Amino acid sequence: TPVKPNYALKFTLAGHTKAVSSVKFSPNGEWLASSSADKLIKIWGAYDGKFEKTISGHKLGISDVAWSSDSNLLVSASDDKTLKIWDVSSGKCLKTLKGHSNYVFCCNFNPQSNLIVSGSFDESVRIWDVKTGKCLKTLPAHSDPVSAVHFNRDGSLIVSSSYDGLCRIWDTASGQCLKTLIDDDNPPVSFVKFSPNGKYILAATLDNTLKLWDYSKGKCLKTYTGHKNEKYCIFANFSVTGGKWIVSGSEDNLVYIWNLQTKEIVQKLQGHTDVVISTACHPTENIIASAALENDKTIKLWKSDC
Amino acid sequence: SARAXVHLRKS
Amino acid sequence: EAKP
Ligand SMILES: [K+]
Ligand SMILES: [K+]
Ligand SMILES: [K+]
Ligand code: NA
Ligand code: NA
């Protein structure tokens, strides 16, 4: 029956020399990519955590990394005010994306992987051409740093979030705003992403709350609480390979897993020794990756039987 | 990494 | 704005 998951620690991935900022599984399921304040990207085996390579070139720390759909490219977002596009097999920087005027905080490819979206401390969202490395559009999107950016499943929409308390949905082709989601209040919105069915947006706010939104109708459907999140922009996820969960890091050093429908906490994963800034869910297997800040600096791989 | 508390975003 |  829909039984609770039993995620258990299988591997701990050491090697970053400063806080880890982001981990992401490759769409083909083979790899995990991590970014860090240490200015490095590392690649690891998705199933056994095996260290594969280090990818270097940024001049300052990296806050986010993201895969192309074919698992061959990565893009990274850095305090050096650039994004870089990387060929994962060679480790070579293909393009440096220049235009932001402050730290680049978040990034993603669209599904066709001909575009990249970025968000920055400069309060803008930018849309970039992967082939040329040119900025196509600069959106005056927010009135505070942009914490997250994500394309929907056909690349026609971008969702963005900001410390200004807004979540906005943009038309990719024109760069114009389709919708602003605001609630009864405007705590900072620290993370957003579209759901695997394209229908919902998951949004984190720095009042220790996650919310599931129907974005067509513009309304909140579910609220998830019990974790600690008032300071950091922590990644959250839909887990869909087994039971239907919401997964998030927490400032009490735990990974939280909720039942998406009932909103109950079903598991808390103990082991990290600093804020769990990032979690990710494997595309086909019941595997979670988590990563933590300065006092820990490791990535952990957890596996469940369901 | 700006992502890796409160002080930078309020500075 | 363009039509792919
Ligand atoms: K490759
Ligand atoms: K703006
Ligand atoms: K297990
Ligand atoms: Na599934
Ligand atoms: Na620190």
Which of A41, A59, A105 should one mutate to test binding to chain B, selecting the residue with the greatest count of B CBs within 10 A?
A105
Structure token pair of residue A29? 């399921």
Q: Beta strands A189-194 and A177-181: pairing type?
A: unpaired
Distance, in angstroms, between A173 CA and closest chain C CA?
6
Method used to determine the 3D structure: X-ray
Please compute, for residue A161, the number of CA atoms within 13 A of its CA located in the half-sphere on the CB side. 24
Residue of A63, A144, A163 with shortest CB distance to B3: A63
Residue corresponding to tokens 């293909």? A94
**Helix (H) or strand (E) segment spanning residue A12:** strand A8-13
Cα–Cα dist A185/A211, whole Å: 13
- Partners of residue B1 in chain A, C-beta under 8 Å: 18-19, 21, 35-37, 61-63, 79
Distance, in angstroms, between A231 CA and closest chain B CA?
5
- What secondary structure letter does DSSP report for A59? S
Number of domains forming the structure of chain A: 1
Residue A121 belongs to a domain with what CATH number?
2.130.10.10
**Helix (H) or strand (E) segment spanning residue A93:** strand A92-98
- Partners of residue B9 in chain A, C-beta under 8 Å: 121, 144-145, 163
| Resolution reading in Å | 1.5
Cα A99 to the chain's mean position, in Å? 22
Distance, in angstroms, between A111 CA and closest chain C CA?
15
Cβ neighbours of residue A243 closer than 8 Å, sequence gap 6 or more: A2, A3, A4, A5, A259, A266, A306
Which ligand has the minimum distance to the alpha carbon of residue B1?
Answer: 5
Cα–Cα dist A175/C2, whole Å: 11
- Residue A33's domain comprises 1-306
Cα A259 to the chain's mean position, in Å? 20
Distances (CA, A) of A245 to A71, A208, A230, A238: 25, 18, 22, 6
Cα–Cα dist A271/A291, whole Å: 11
Structure token pair of residue A39? 């200015």
- Partners of residue C4 in chain A, C-beta under 8 Å: 173
Whole-number Å distance, alpha carbon A48 to ligand 1 midpoint, is 19
Do the Cβ atoms of A58 and A99 come closer than 8 Å?
Answer: no
Closest C-alpha among A157, A227, A235 to residue A203: A235
Cβ neighbours of residue A244 closer than 8 Å, sequence gap 6 or more: A238, A259, A260, A261
Which class for A226: exposed (0-12), middle (13-18), buried (19 or more C-beta within 10 A)? middle
Inter-chain residue contact A63 with B6, CB threshold 8 Å: no
